[PDB]
């Protein structure tokens, strides 16, 4: 979301460590936009067992294609109930032009109706607005 979560309960900085207004560290009391991420993470068990891990976020935006230009895609999905499907297709149409997202949705959709006995499709783009949501005969 490109913005650090505002830490809570930060009123008066600890008087046993500087840095807390001494320029160094900036506790995140407010929703600050992130500029150029490169993040660390601590975890210390009470028994004296520490672990750090350094993260490099991926920076990269959405290109300018020529396909979804006038080409409607097919969004399909599967779940456990009419709801689990109704939801995914809802999330589909809200992002009808996000091709990374929809591709991924489709890959998931591929699950035997032995496990996910509920399926549904939708035609994003095109004056279809065409969406069926049915149950699915078991067996092969």
């Amino acid at each position: 979301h490109g913005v650090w979560a505002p830490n809570l309960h930060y009123h008066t900085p600890n008087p046993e460590i500087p840095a807390l207004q001494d320029g160094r560290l900036q506790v995140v009391d407010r929703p600050l936009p992130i500029r150029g991420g490169n993040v660390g993470i601590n975890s210390f068990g009470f028994g004296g067992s520490n672990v750090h891990v350094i993260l490099q976020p991926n920076s990269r935006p959405a290109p300018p294609p020529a396909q979804h230009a006038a080409l409607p895609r097919l969004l399909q999905a599967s779940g456990r109930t009419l709801e689990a499907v109704q939801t995914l297709l809802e999330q589909g149409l809200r992002h009808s032009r996000d091709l990374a997202f929809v591709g991924m949705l489709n890959e998931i959709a591929a699950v035997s109706p032995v496990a996910m006995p509920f399926r549904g499709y939708a035609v994003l783009g095109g004056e279809a607005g065409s969406q069926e949501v049915q149950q699915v005969p078991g067996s092969k």
Partner: peptide
């Protein structure tokens, strides 16, 4: 993200 490094001591 991508994991750059990690390690634990005690």
């Amino acid at each position: 993200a991508t994991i750059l490094n990690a390690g634990t001591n005690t």
